[PDB]
Structure formats: structure tokens, C-alpha cells
């Protein structure tokens, strides 16, 4: 279904281009940065137009289209121009906010200066420009049209302090794409800052004035966070950065960026800049958006199978800040394809990307049919598990409602040969020696079990947040005494399950053997072989507890991680290792595997072991 247009067209497409007065239309040679908004219906695509070049430092004017027939057809204009100082003169990384029937573009403007703005000693040859576009619509003569008058740039200058905690400024500018209005009304713009000492890092700047005057929020990201965007999710911002060569970095703020926190539990550290996670970053798409009555969010960056900057493989991403799943490929094949811009308006799915040849970029638009499909068939699945869970009559009449809150992965009914298969369809498990059984899976035999990927996902790693906190639940059934002690459930540190940091197993005594991170394991309580067991692992604040049928074993909440250090989880292991090389054999039945990003209280585990029996999804298929 999916189609696009060559619509920012390199070494093709052409600008009018002003200088002393005059008025030319001039070929572009590459077009990058794209943004893509909506304006009162009027779709408007803002980017860099590099006229002679793609390389970064050369003359750049901001270019804008606008289309009022959903994108068929086009206006074209130059929203800001340099300063026509030298060859390199520039504008640049256009950074938009919409707000009302207006345009804020944020840019960096450098008269002579011959490196990267980054590499620079001094603010010499720098200035930090707004300027605002107003947008007007017509209807004369039964045609629908617009028009777009920008204003002046207006330097910001005067609002950046020299000084921030432990460190003097240098330059700053936007982080690129699209940038937001605030629910109370502000004008935010992600921003990335240099320091004297060449540290680059990200901020929060803000306007509660209409833009007359700007505030940076007095927290800021990790060093090396570089072209931040942000979105407003339940009353916070949640700033997501690119690292060169490291895991992109996720904050929250509530406080217009007084104070940050790391998304450990959420969304920090998920998405790899490539296979190996050790290759250039980039600019990605990141808004919060409403689909058939869901509130979500959609992420771009491309997985970079080639390396280096040549960012191949633009892939698109839908979370509901719990679940995180892979809508596919954007881009086509393997071409290079690094910065993107999405747009959600009137039910239908756009996005404005960069495609790269040779060094020579052109802009896509694209008409992302496919992907919303899948998108709105997935959201249906979540909504539709959530209300299943939801529904449920609680045993204690009506008990408290099963929660739903937090809740990332399950584990039911749907099985198949090797995989066991996820209801919010984003992560399935793998297995051995499994047959099927209601709402679960029977396993047998050395090398028995299923592995649910952590760090094992690869590049983009969906339950990181498992290594700040979390509550795997199952009900388990033991079929045979072990010879000596064997594994039901878990999270494995490395690749065999040999290194715990939290799990649950049986030994030939009868009793239950917890593990707590690498302290000597001490036997307790007691098992019948046949009885349907439920348990709980609760992780948080590096303490680890483990509760059968509702109440807490021996032990419980003990220290799993040396202060200092924090995790990093292969995997979770289920009804055995899933591992040939591990001599154990755990003969069990597992049903109904969750998986919460925190710790349950105790009500929230009491109502899910009375409610063993409702939860499994056979018959809601």
C-alpha cells in the first residue's frame, strides 16, 4: 500500500534564492534535516537546502514546501536565509515548533568559521536565530490555497548564560525535527550546548511568553548526548538523544528540565545506532500521538547495518511507554537513509526522509499506508489483552481488577514448534522440548525450557528496563522429584543461566531454592509434585524478593546487585535453561508468564494468584 515521491529532489530541485535584493530560482545540490508538521491542515516539510554541497560546513539556506492537498502537490520557498557572508555561510539544523498558525524555526547561523561547530574554540562565528512563520489560509473563489509570510530571524543570544553547574558555555543549537508546545502552554525546544572544554550535552529551552524570551531549565542529559528530541508524556518531557558509538539516552523531566532523570524503566538505553552499537548516531522522529483513541508514541532512527554515517535501514518504532514494537523498514532496501521526520494527521501516516547516495541527499515523502495498518492492528491487540485482564471478576462478588499497568509481555495460550508467543506481540520466547497445554507449555529433558530475550534482542533491547526493576509472574507445576536442584524461573545474567541475578528453582528435598544475585543459596519451605504453584520475582531498588502463592519465601529481599554496578540481563528463563550444555532437567508445566516493568505491591500479587485460573487466553482467541 505504502508509496512515496522523490519530493526534495537533489541536484534537481530548485529554491528562490535572494541575495542583495534579488530574486533568483537556484538549483539545490542535497536536501537533509527534514521536519514535517501540520498547520491548521496545511501540511508544511522544512529542512536544510545545501546548495552547492551535502558537506556540513557550505552555504545552506532553510527551505520550506507547504501543501494544502494532503501532499500531492507543493509551495516552495526559503524560510531563512544565511548571511551571504562566505561560501560557507549557513543556517542550520531547523528545528520546528507549531503553535497556533505559527511557525518557530530555531537555527544556527555561521558567517566564516571553516570546522564543525563542535570543534570550535570560541562563540565568534556564531548566532542562535528564531524566526516565525505565519501561516494564512484562503478560500476565494471556492479554491482552497495558502500562503506563508516568514518574519525576520531574531537573535536568542541574549538568553544564553555563560555559566552553567560546573562549566562555561559556548555555542548551542537546536536538536533538530520537530520540537513541541507544552500542555501549559510553553514553547519547548530540546537543545544540544558545547562548554568550553568541547563537552557536547543536551537541554531543555523554553519560552512562556510566545518566544520574546527564553529560560534553559538548570538539568541537562549525560555528556556526548547530542540532537535531543522531545515529546510531553503524562505530564513530563521525556528528551530522547542520539550518543555517538553508545546506546541512545532517555529523560524525563516534570519541571521544565529543572531536574532530569534517566527513563531506566522505560526507554533509556533500548535503541542501538547499530548492530554493534559502536557507530555514529542520529536525528530521529519522536512524537506523542493519539491512534483509534490510544495514546502513543512513534520513533524513527535507522539500524546503520553499514556503518559509519551511511545510516541505512530507517526503521519505525510504536510505544505505548510500556510496550515497544517493531513497525518495520521505512526505507527501501538498502539504501542510505538517515534522518526522518514523521507526521500523523487526519488519520493518515507521512514521513519526510532523507535518502543518500554517493553523498548527494534528496527528501522522500512518503505515504505510510503499510505501517499504519500494522500499527492500528497491533494497538488493537494491546487494547483488547488489557481489557481481557481488565474485565476479569477477581475471586473476594469482585475483587480488585487484575492490573494491567505496567505490564509488557504474555505468555499464554498461543504456542507454536520453537517460539512462545507474546499476546502484546513485541517479544516472543524461544523454546525446547515444549508441547503445548492450556494457556502454556509442558517441558522435559536436558536443555528443556524457554529463553525470553534480554540483552540477547540484539541492537534494539525492549526489556532493558528489567535491569532497574521489574515482576515476572508464572504459575508452575513440577512432574517428576529432580535428582538435584533445577530451575523453573529466572533472570539469567550471562548466557548459560549459570549467573543469576534473581530465580526461583526446586531441589530433591522438596523445598524451594531461591537465588538471590550470587549469595549462597539456602533451601526453604516445600513443594507437592502435581500442585499448581504460583510465583512472583519482584525486583526494584536492587533488592530481590520471591513469593509462592502470595506470600514472600525465606530470605526474601535480599541485595541481588553490588551497590556501585548495574545489571545487564541475558534473558529470563523459563521451566528450564533452554540450554543443551546445562545438565539439569526440570520436567514442569509453566502457564501464563508476565512481565511488569516494577515492583507489584502486595495486593497487585495476591489478586494475580487468586486469579490463576481467569487470566489464560484460550478462549478470548
Not at 554515517?309 to 526505507?331: A, F, H, P
Request: with cysteine; net charge neutral.
Amino acid at each position: 500500500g505504502s508509496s512515496r515521491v522523490e519530493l526534495f529532489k537533489r541536484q534537481s530541485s530548485k529554491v528562490p534564492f535572494e541575495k542583495d535584493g534579488k530574486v533568483t530560482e537556484r538549483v539545490v545540490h542535497s536536501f537533509r534535516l527534514p521536519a514535517l508538521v501540520n498547520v491548521d491542515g496545511v501540511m508544511v516539510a522544512i529542512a536544510d537546502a545545501r546548495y552547492e554541497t551535502s558537506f556540513d560546513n557550505s552555504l545552506i539556506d532553510t527551505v520550506a514546501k507547504y501543501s494544502v492537498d494532503d501532499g500531492e502537490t507543493w509551495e516552495t520557498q526559503i524560510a531563512i536565509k544565511n548571511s551571504r557572508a562566505s561560501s560557507v555561510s549557513r543556517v542550520v539544523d531547523p528545528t520546528v515548533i507549531v503553535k497556533g498558525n505559527k511557525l518557530y524555526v530555531l537555527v544556527g547561523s555561521y558567517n566564516s568559521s571553516r570546522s564543525y561547530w563542535t570543534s570550535h574554540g570560541d562563540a565568534r562565528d556564531w548566532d542562535i536565530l528564531l524566526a516565525v512563520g505565519e501561516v494564512t489560509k484562503s478560500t476565494a473563489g471556492g479554491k482552497i490555497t495558502a500562503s506563508i509570510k516568514w518574519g525576520s530571524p531574531v537573535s536568542l543570544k541574549e538568553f544564553f548564560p555563560a555559566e552553567m553547574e560546573g562549566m562555561h558555555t559556548n555555542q548551542f543549537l537546536g536538536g533538530a525535527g520537530v520540537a513541541i508546545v507544552a500542555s501549559n502552554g510553553n514553547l519547548v525546544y530540546p537543545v544540544q550546548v558545547t562548554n568550553k572544554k568541547k563537552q557536547v550535552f543536551s537541554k531543555i529551552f523554553y519560552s512562556e511568553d510566545e518566544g520574546k524570551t527564553w529560560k534553559f531549565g538548570k538539568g541537562r542529559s549525560a555528556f556526548g548526548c547530542s540532537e535531543p528530541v522531545a515529546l510531553e508524556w503524562e505530564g513530563k518531557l521525556i528528551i530522547n538523544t542520539r550518543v555517538d558509538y553508545r546506546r541512545r539516552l532517555v529523560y524525563e523531566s516534570s519541571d521544565m528540565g529543572n531536574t532530569w532523570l534517566e527513563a531506566v524503566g522505560t526507554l533509556s538505553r533500548v535503541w542501538g545506532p547499530s548492530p554493534k552499537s559502536n557507530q555514529p548516531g542520529s536525528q530521529s522522529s519522536f512524537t506523542a500521538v493519539t491512534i483509534e483513541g490510544m495514546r502513543v508514541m512513534l520513533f524513527t532512527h535507522p539500524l546503520n547495518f553499514k556503518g559509519r554515517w551511511l545510516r541505512d535501514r530507517l526503521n519505525l518504532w510504536l510505544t505505548d511507554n510500556q510496550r515497544i514494537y517493531n513497525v518495520g523498514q521505512v526505507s527501501i532496501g538498502d539504501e542510505n537513509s538517515a534522518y526522518s521526520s514523521v507526521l500523523y494527521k487526519d488519520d493518515k501516516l507521512y514521513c519526510l526522509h532523507e535518502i543518500n547516495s554517493n553523498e548527494v541527499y534528496s527528501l522522500v515523502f512518503a505515504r505510510l499506508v503499510g505501517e499504519l495498518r500494522i500499527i492500528k492492528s497491533v494497538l488493537q491487540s494491546w487494547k483488547n489483552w488489557d481489557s481481557h485482564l481488565s474485565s476479569i471478576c477477581t475471586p473476594a462478588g469482585c475483587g480488585p481488577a487484575v492490573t494491567t499497568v505496567g505490564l509488557v509481555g504474555f505468555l499464554s495460550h498461543s504456542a507454536t514448534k520453537t517460539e512462545w508467543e507474546d499476546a502484546y506481540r513485541c517479544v516472543n520466547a524461544s523454546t525446547a522440548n515444549a508441547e503445548r497445554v492450556p494457556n502454556g507449555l509442558k517441558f522435559a529433558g536436558v536443555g528443556g525450557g524457554a529463553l525470553w530475550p534480554v540483552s540477547q534482542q540484539g541492537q534494539n533491547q525492549r526489556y532493558h528496563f528489567a535491569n532497574h526493576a521489574f515482576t515476572l509472574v508464572a504459575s508452575v507445576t513440577i512432574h517428576e522429584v529432580p535428582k538435584g536442584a533445577s530451575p523453573l524461573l529466572g533472570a539469567s545474567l550471562d548466557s548459560s543461566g549459570g549467573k543469576k541475578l534473581l530465580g526461583l528453582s526446586y531441589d530433591k528435598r522438596h523445598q524451594w531454592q531461591p537465588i538471590y544475585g550470587s549469595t549462597p543459596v539456602t533451601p526453604t519451605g516445600s513443594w507437592e509434585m502435581g500442585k499448581r504453584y504460583h510465583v512472583v520475582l519482584t525486583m526494584a531498588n536492587k533488592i530481590g524478593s520471591v513469593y509462592i502463592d502470595g506470600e514472600p519465601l525465606e530470605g526474601s529481599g535480599q541485595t541481588v546487585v553490588p551497590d556501585e554496578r548495574t545489571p545487564d540481563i541475558s534473558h529470563f528463563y523459563v521451566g528450564g535453561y533452554k540450554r543443551s550444555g546445562m545438565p539439569t532437567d526440570s520436567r514442569v508445566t509453566v502457564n501464563n508468564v508476565l512481565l511488569y516493568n516494577r515492583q507489584l505491591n502486595a495486593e497487585e500479587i495476591r489478586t494475580l494468584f487468586l486469579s490463576q485460573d481467569l487470566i489464560g487466553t484460550e478462549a478470548h482467541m
